[model samples]
Target: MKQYLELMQKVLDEGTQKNDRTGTGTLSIFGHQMRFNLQDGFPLVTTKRCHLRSIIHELLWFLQGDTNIAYLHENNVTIWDEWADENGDLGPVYGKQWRAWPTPDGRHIDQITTVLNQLKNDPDSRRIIVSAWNVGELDKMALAPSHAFFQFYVADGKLSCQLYQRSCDVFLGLPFNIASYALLVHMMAQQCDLEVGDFVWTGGDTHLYSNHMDQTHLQLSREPRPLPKLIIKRKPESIFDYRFEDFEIEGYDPHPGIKAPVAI
Candidate 1:
């Protein structure tokens, strides 16, 4: 996790101050990347404890093509509460675009289903990608996606995934994004019966919100422990068939979580 700690320190040292959407302002940088070898360990942040519960369920809900927070509310993850409408709708956000992106001609594209098929039958293809940045629907979204697009690559029986995020909250959101995608790569590789390779994360306009500075420095000062391992109890019938209980994280002995407010 030195890459992550260094990213934080870099932002604090080299980022330029700028005003932002939430009025909280930021110390922001542009264009950075990190690669985590999944064979080493799960890339969970070791300096600060984080709850995996929300990350797991959120990915599942997205796979379901849900555009509302009802599923999350029932599961008690309040992270999306700030953006949902009174009816719990979030317009054509990640789930809607990823699972059922609409066509102007009135058809829909299920990007997730398409990519899964490619992983199984066309592993040699270079364009095995999924994107949530639907140009036609961005205006209708509750919030623009930060972790925007991803692609998968396969060679020598190992699958690797690279994710590109256009916007990032360094202190609060980046770790969650990293672990979430590593988990995704793990699940996808499991379904494809391939060994894990790497999870490459690339970011643009990465920033730390002004208010999170104290916690950011606090985490940077702490020693990072060895990464924890992720254990999936059983291979589910399909990626969509996974239940939250099917996942387990082992050996994650992190420091206490540092609290910070979401800029929005």
Candidate 2:
């Protein structure tokens, strides 16, 4: 996770103070990138102890293509709870868009399955992608998408993945995205029988909020610990079939949590 910590510091040093969409003043930068070599270790941020349960559950829920918060609630994951309406609807977010987005012909597209099949059937194809930005949909998300799109690439018997995030909340959520996507890359690689390569991340409007500055210094003060080792106990029948119990982690030691309000 050195790449992550260094990138954070780079952003802090170079970012300009600017106003953001959520009314949070940020030391904002419109661009950034991270390259993660998964073979080194799991890419969970090592400076602070990460909540793997919440992020893992969230990823599973997103792959399930469910927009309701009930599944999350049942699993004890609550990050998305704030976005659910009275009916538990979230206006076609990552899950719905990824799994069951409606096309004009009254059909639906399963982007994840499609990409998986692409990796299996046509490893040479350069067009493998999964996107959450449904064209005709306003997306109703915080900004375009927090995890807008991603692509999988394979070469030399190894699989790599890259995610393009349109809106990255650096201090509070970007680490979660980095860890989750890296995990997703590992899963897809295992399912495809390929070695894990790298996870590349590019962001748009990446920023740390005004209130988070103090806490972020704490993040910088501590040294990064050795990255955790992920133990996926079983291979699920499909990507969406993984249960929380199937996963475990080893070797993660980090400093205590830092608190900062999410600028809603």
Candidate 3:
């Protein structure tokens, strides 16, 4: 996870202080990108212990076209607890937009299915993309998409993904984003019968919260351990049919968890 460590170090060394919507200041950098080769092992941050359970559950929930936090709560995943309303709804967030983006003509577009079909039938097509930044329904969302747009590419029978994050919380959110997208690339490759390739992460307004400086430095002090391998026990009928029980993370040895407050 040298890539992750370098990103942290880059922000700390070159980032500028800026105010944000949460009233918490951040050490902000304009644009940055990183790549993780899936063949090199899963990109879970090794500098600090990260809970893969939440990341798995959250990804499954998003793939389910679910906008409410009930599914998450049922699985004991509380990461979305803060953003949900009294009814555990996050409005039209990632899942809704990914699986059921509404059209003005009263039809819902399933972007995931489209991407899958494109990969199978037209691997050379450059248009394989899924976007959660639905401008038409921005006001209806609990939070506007941060990891907004992502595109998949295929070459040499390998599946690679690139995500464009509009606003990044470097210390807390960036690690989760990297692991989540890498996992997605793995799943996509499995379902499509292609080998996993690289996951490219591009960020805009990338930042670490002013309050999380201590935690960031503490994480930086530790040496990154070996990368972990992800195991998918079974290939589901489709990407949406996957359950949390089907996934496993092996050979992950990392430092202790460092507690940090979320800016939001």
Candidate 4:
């Protein structure tokens, strides 16, 4: 949480003003990173209330290899609503790219399942990765992905994850992004029977949209609350089996939700 706070502070203090596709404009930076050791606690954003349910369900849906927004909409999650087609399709996005990436031969690769097997069979494998950025399918997506890719690492019986976001709207998206990936790390650790290690975040084009500067400053002025705890119910034996109702959060207190328009 402190790490998140510091990142926002740094962006406000040093980011450069720039216009963007949203027409909202921004004060942005080229690169930044944050790391959290899962042994300490879940790396949820304490500066603002983060909804763990949607985050958990979203991860599960992605692992299920679903590229449609139907499941998310059914769970009242609107994060991906803007990008979906009338039929709720977000063609070849994270889920499709990660789990069923299409091949010229009509075969599909399930990266999530493949990675887990690798971790179990070859713990030292450097290739234990699940990537969502498929260059071949980028043009087919409704929108190019911002959280472009992620990787995993295993050592000393601990599992860690690193996310590389190519672009971010800091004020509105970074907090959710952090929680989402951290939760993914936890679920993966549980499935792999390894102690949770770390969640590393690497970002390119991380920025605060211009109109959010005041809100960002106001948030920085507010005192941060203690990190919240996530309560996962009915621990699923496999990462692919988690349902929306199986997750909960306790002790989360923060300022009211802030609204910022998306950049499309």
RMSD of each: 0.8, 1.3, 0.7, 1.6
Q: Least accurate stretch of 10 residues (summed lDDT) in model 3?
A: 72-81
Q: What lDDT tens digits, residue by residue, belong to model 3 across residues 219-259?
A: 88898888999999998888888888898899999899999
TM-score for each candidate, following the candidate numbering? 0.98, 0.96, 0.99, 0.94
What value of lDDT does candidate 3 attain over all alpha carbons?
A: 0.91
Model 2: per-residue Cα lDDT over 89-122, one tens digit each: 7888888889988899999999888989999999
State residue 161's C-alpha deviation in candidate 3, in Å.
0.5
lDDT of 1: 0.92
Output the lDDT of residue 249, model 4. 67
lDDT (Cα, tens digit) per residue for candidate 1, span 1-264: 799999999999999999998999999999999899999999999899887888888889998999899999899888899899999999999999888999999999999889999999999999999999999889999999888999999989999999999999988888888998999999999998999999999999999999998998899889999899999999988888999999989999998899999988
Best by lDDT: 1
Model 3 RMSD vs true structure = 0.7
Q: Rank the candidates by lDDT, best first.
A: 1, 3, 2, 4
Q: Report the candidate with higher lDDT, 1 versus 3.
A: 1
After superposing candidate 1 on the true structure, give the runs of residues whose Cα lies further than 4 Å from its correct spot: none
lDDT score, residue 189, model 2?
84
